[PDB]
Amino acid sequence: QCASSPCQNGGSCKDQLQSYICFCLPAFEGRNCETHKDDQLICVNENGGCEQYCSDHTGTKRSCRCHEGYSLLADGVSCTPTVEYPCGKIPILE
Amino acid sequence: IVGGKVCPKGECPWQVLLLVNGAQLCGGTLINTIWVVSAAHCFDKIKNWRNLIAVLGEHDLSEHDGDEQSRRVAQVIIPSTYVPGTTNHDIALLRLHQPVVLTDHVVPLCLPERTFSERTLAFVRFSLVSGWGQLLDRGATALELMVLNVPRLMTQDCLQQSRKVGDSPNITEYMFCAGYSDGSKDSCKGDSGGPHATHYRGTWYLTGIVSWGQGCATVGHFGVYTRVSQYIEWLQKLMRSEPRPGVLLRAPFP
Amino acid sequence: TVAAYNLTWKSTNFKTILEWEPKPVNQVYTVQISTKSGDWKSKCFYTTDTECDLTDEIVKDVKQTYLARVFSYPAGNVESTGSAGEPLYENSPEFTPYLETNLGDERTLVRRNNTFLSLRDVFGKDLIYTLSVQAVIPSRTVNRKSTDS
Numbered sequence: 001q002c003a004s005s006p007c008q009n010g011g012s013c014k015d016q017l018q019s020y021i022c023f024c025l026p027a028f029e030g031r032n033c034e035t036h037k038d039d040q041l042i043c044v045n046e047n048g049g050c051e052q053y054c055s056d057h058t059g060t061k062r063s064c065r066c067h068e069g070y071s072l073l074a075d076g077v078s079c080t081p082t083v084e085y086p087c088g089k090i091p092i093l094e
Numbered sequence: 095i096v097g098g099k100v101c102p103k104g105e106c107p108w109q110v111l112l113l114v115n116g117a118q119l120c121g122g123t124l125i126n127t128i129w130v131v132s133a134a135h136c137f138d139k140i141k142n143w144r145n146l147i148a149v150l151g152e153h154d155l156s157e158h159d160g161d162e163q164s165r166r167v168a169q170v171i172i173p174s175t176y177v178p179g180t181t182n183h184d185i186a187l188l189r190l191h192q193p194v195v196l197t198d199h200v201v202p203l204c205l206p207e208r209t210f211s212e213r214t215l216a217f218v219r220f221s222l223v224s225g226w227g228q229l230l231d232r233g234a235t236a237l238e239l240m241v242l243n244v245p246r247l248m249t250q251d252c253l254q255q256s257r258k259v260g261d262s263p264n265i266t267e268y269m270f271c272a273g274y275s276d277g278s279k280d281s282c283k284g285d286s287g288g289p290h291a292t293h294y295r296g297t298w299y300l301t302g303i304v305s306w307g308q309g310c311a312t313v314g315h316f317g318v319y320t321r322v323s324q325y326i327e328w329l330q331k332l333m334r335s336e337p338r339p340g341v342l343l344r345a346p347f348p
Numbered sequence: 349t350v351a352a353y354n355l356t357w358k359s360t361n362f363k364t365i366l367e368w369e370p371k372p373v374n375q376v377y378t379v380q381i382s383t384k385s386g387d388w389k390s391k392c393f394y395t396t397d398t399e400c401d402l403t404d405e406i407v408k409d410v411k412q413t414y415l416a417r418v419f420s421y422p423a424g425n426v427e428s429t430g431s432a433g434e435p436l437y438e439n440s441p442e443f444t445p446y447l448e449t450n451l452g453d454e455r456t457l458v459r460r461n462n463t464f465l466s467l468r469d470v471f472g473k474d475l476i477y478t479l480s481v482q483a484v485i486p487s488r489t490v491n492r493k494s495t496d497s
């Protein structure tokens with residue numbers, strides 16, 4: 001258990017009744033602080049971070065897209081409308 | 095709509111109201127200036143195919159204000175797999191005669207991209223359904239537009255929680271369920287065709303179409319919607335084809 | 349694809365892990381967790397593990413009640429859908445960290461603005477001790493006492 005340092009990626013182990021508790025650092029999670037939070041940037045994982053559409057590519061980063069009437073911005077995730085009455089926006093709450 | 099509130103005029107801009115001979119038919123959604131989506135059964139008893147109009151901008155059905163826009167419906171296309179009288183493949187694409195003018199009270203709803211629908215919108219818990227349909231299983235229809243916020247369920251949990259029978263269709267892969275089962279909130283007769291809209295990061299997309307599953311606000315039951323995801327392809331394809339020669343059109347599906 | 353079964357929450361000082369069965373011969377699992385009224389968030393994407401760590405999510409509001417489900421996909425067609433075009437899944441019991449986590453000042457996996465909170469900063473006057481010492485949260489239904497040192 002802790003003796004047998006099971007916690008990875010900087011984590012600290014706390015012992016219990018044979019069991020232990022790993023306290024990980026902000027970027028990792030898992031029983032043994034082993035999963036890295038920054039390696040699951042896929043479209044199934046919170047839409048890849050894209051505001052509207054996301055695409056996963058083989059061996060290369062996923063790309064975000066926009067709906068007709070909007071343009072992807074500089075950050076590559078957010079879309080902004082290029083029209084006056086872009087779909088799905090409520091003018092009176094704008 | 096049972097359990098809903100009144101939609102603050104202008105907050106449901108994609109809501110359509112179809113009329114036949116002047117009488118209310120169904121509701122519908124505006125996806126673009128000449129295209130509206132509604133529920134195929136609403137055209138099960140139409141033999142006055144030119145006396146069909148669509149209104150946008152609408153809110154209070156008793157007074158006219160400066161907003162309602164009306165266009166005749168030039169064409170009605172339904173899956174060639176819908177069966178006159180069922181709830182499966184209950185989707186209709188209506189081609190207006192002339193476009194509408196978007197304004198603060200008339201904007202379309204984004205028809206989302208399948209993948210995004212299936213993978214992201216579908217796990218957004220609450221969406222809105224709206225209409226001027228009965229306010230109680232067999233009560234008065236509304237005059238102001240009413241909107242209901244419902245939770246969606248996956249078929250496994252819907253089936254799991256519904257009471258067992260009535261002469262119900264099955265929840266096919268072309269449907270989904272949303273609602274409460276404690277007969278408190280639900281879509282209702284008169285709301286048919288209207289929208290089920292999900293709000294994802296700032297925009298609303300059309301995730302469903304109010305079908306007719308459950309008389310209206312029953313107990314041990316949920317409301318059934320048409321799963322639009324299964325039809326984006328189809329709609330899109332139809333929206334880019336030449337006008338073809340028919341008011342009712344039954345397009346091949348898929 | 350068989351669905352997962354025996355979904356269990358294993359939680360001590362808020363470190364919350366869900367575990368389940370079976371151990372997957374040619375299928376993968378993905379876990380989703382939500383609150384009664386929240387959207388579902390996915391974790392442990394397409395794994396072959398039978399445990400998922402949700403601490404990150406439940407420590408956000410330890411007083412909410414979470415519900416989770418595990419989906420099973422064959423491996424390869426991890427798009428897999430069944431008759432009603434959705435992926436095979438099973439749900440877990442509800443877990444309300446604050447009322448069902450296990451106990452052992454102590455640090456918890458609960459974090460506030462980057463730091464970790466402690467047993468008392470999390471249970472205020474609902475935490476009492478005994479003398480050998482045991483930790484007791486009398487305002488509980490289950491897991492009201494800890495163990496002893």
Ligand SMILES: Nc1ccc2[nH]c(-c3cc(CC(=O)O)cc(-c4cccc([N+](=O)[O-])c4)c3O)cc2n1
Nearest residue numbers: 135136137138139281282283284286305306309310
């Ligand atoms: N929760 C809901 C939501 C929408 C609903 N719509 C209906 C509905 C019920 C009937 C009467 C019946 O049960 O046969 C008729 C229609 C209806 C509406 C418009 C057009 C036609 N049609 O066949 O030309 C039928 C309904 O939408 C029930 C219902 N329930």
